[PDB]
Symmetry: D2
């Protein structure tokens, strides 16, 4: 995807799992990849900006800082995988709010402050990823299911409001092999390598593809929707789910 080369791409958390796979892809494409998270992902091919995306003030500044640097913002990839930080475990009513903070409001803040700069740039597209926790098991997954659907609605607003200047799309993954899913397995069956393997195999057979997805497979869809190859695709969710939703 030659068009992605040198475009400024912000991934919100690029240390592990999906965020990492995404980050990897755009680097192979030749982007200026910026990592908006609370952790430096170690690799010196991405540039990290210290920010808690649930805090609007931190997002506001961080975005402006990013724009003073690379003088451009093309792609905004909103994603939440192991930056849902607190006590988890279970809890409930404060936990319900915090999951909505991370999985919805972090998407709104990053979007509200990026849009004004993005429209100034070339081929701006925003790609929103649903939580992997959406289809798994009710610890109490209601907040995940809710903020996934919320994120669709958000995607659809942005799409409609900012066409034809800027594009917006959602990627909706099923269960993907990530630190987040490995944790869910562990909370269900403990920390035995075989038992976690067996459980993950079991979740795989829930999908008609008879396996769970790979982060690389969600990286592809994001790259595609952010690419010029998707220049007429906007306001939609692309299901990367191994045919779970059918």
């Amino acid at each position: 995807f030659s068009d992605l080369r040198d475009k400024v791409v912000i991934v919100t958390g690029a240390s592990m799992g999906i965020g990492r796979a995404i980050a990897e892809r755009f680097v192979d494409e030749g982007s200026k990849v910026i990592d908006l998270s609370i952790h430096d992902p170690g690799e010196a091919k991405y540039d990290h900006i210290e920010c808690d995306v649930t805090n609007p003030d931190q997002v506001k500044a961080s975005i402006d800082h990013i724009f003073k640097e690379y003088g451009s913002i093309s792609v905004l990839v909103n994603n939440a995988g192991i930056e849902s930080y607190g006590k988890i475990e279970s809890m409930s009513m404060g936990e319900w709010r915090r999951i909505i903070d991370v999985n919805l409001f972090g998407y709104y803040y990053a979007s509200k402050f990026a849009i004004p700069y993005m429209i100034r740039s070339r081929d701006p597209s925003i790609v929103n990823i649903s939580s992997v926790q959406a289809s798994i098991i009710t610890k109490n997954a209601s907040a995940y299911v809710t903020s996934k659907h919320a994120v669709i609605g958000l995607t659809k607003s942005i799409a409609l409001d900012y066409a034809p200047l800027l594009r917006c799309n959602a990627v909706c993954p099923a269960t993907i092999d990530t630190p987040l899913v490995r944790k869910a397995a562990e909370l269900e069956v403990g920390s035995d390598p075989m038992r976690i393997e067996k459980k993950i195999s079991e979740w795989g057979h829930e999908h008609p593809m008879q396996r769970i997805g790979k982060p690389q497979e969600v990286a592809s869809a994001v790259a595609f929707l952010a690419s010029r190859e998707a220049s007429f695709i906007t306001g939609t969710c692309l299901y990367v789910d191994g045919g779970l939703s059918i």
Copy 2:
């Protein structure tokens, strides 16, 4: 609906418009109606309880109270800058979560429990977002609590409500003829060549709350005059 009679039905924000018409509809049906809002109207037809649904304390208290009075809850109707944005998500979404969270235990033990969430409508952002959130909320509740309790969503388009009457009034002027023309024109966006009536929403809510919809759950009913039929 021969089952709705003497069923306990909580209707949030049942003050005017869509909330009025739904409240009034169950009252027509022989049901015992309780309004959970901040603003109390005049009444003899149905109960009222002062309750800001974005306050979980008040919510919990109010539903506990309701159950102590009636010994039953069969139906719950949840009805609709960054501060303003976060406020809309609080009202349109967090309100539905709090009332649901607290009513459910009581509802699991009552006859034919049914939850019905109404969706809502410069930047329509927080409205659209929360509409979809409510669908997600409906789906998860309906998943977690079947076969004990049913949960469904009504997704109305443009309905003749005071809100919408004003939304035209801001755009063209307070002239009741130009507003009429603006309303008529919005009606033509709908394949049905007209906007909706509050009664027409109240019908769907009453259907989904009754035993008539006993096998229907986790679904949205579009009272939109074909607006989504695209």
Copy 3:
């Protein structure tokens, strides 16, 4: 429904099961019911007209006849190798097109015309295909004919019908205990821990055909016990 009484309602393939229960439901509602099927039952409650809905000649003739008898049609209920495949698309789809095509002109001039299409269920191919086709058919009709006429779809999952009773019977044996176990097990695929009842479908059809759904069009109502709530 105070409007369904003495309304003219055509119900195709209203012989047994889902078609039985829908026919019977309108008869309960004070409506005047006419069955369009190939096989006639015993009756005094509702009319029958011998009509193979996959034959456009017979269809046209039959609806013309119906209108000449009653001077009105308000409701139409369309109810469900390569040869076999093409035969299913003919029944489940082409049948709905022919009855709709011919009834519509008559319906546009009757009180509150409403069309309701029921979806259906080795290779489930032609069934699934035609289910979606019917949704498309519903949508286009509802688009073309608003605000004159409403058209909507009922999408039922597994319902206790003779068909399904047999579909278990082929798989495990004709033993009425193993069939029961096979049915109970299919019920647990549904979040509601049970398959559906024909009455529960008949309820949705009667709702969508009545004035209660006056602003609802081009939509599918899922009577599936949460099966699609995935």
Copy 4:
């Protein structure tokens, strides 16, 4: 997309519009492109097989013939653009059946006879394209809307039945600049270059993108879904519609 190189790809009609753009793409990818239609598309980079896809017997043989040749069938792209042949113009009741023949049954025949051979091959994916006529204007577009939805259902069956061996997906285009759409404009406003231009501009403003799509833009989605990049995507429709459906 290196994985597409040398894979056997059958496009059902590759002379003009979308079918052509598709055909072009996979050739740039390095495929063995086979054209199943009733017209030779002229270009000696595709190989043509004479077949009316609405006739099961012709499809049955043609497919087998194709498999004896290239000994493999990887991709099946079902598409219908100006091979809807008869009198059009309008008509109705026989026209309604014939549109269903072309837009639905041609997809079923090509699929029924390809699947048994496709599963034997590497990374088999079927990509079904909805009619461009779906969203335009009721001459009587009911048959188009119906067979579009029918094609979704078909896609979903195949997906579920043949996972994980074979994948199936739908691409759902809005109005795309094709001979089919240019004809629709012409039937509405006559054969004046300006009037057809104006009308097409008007249809463009119906889409939030303020323009109608390009065949190349539908080519991309097909290439992507047929590609290994979509190896976990199955049973879904990817809307290439400029945000019309939102």
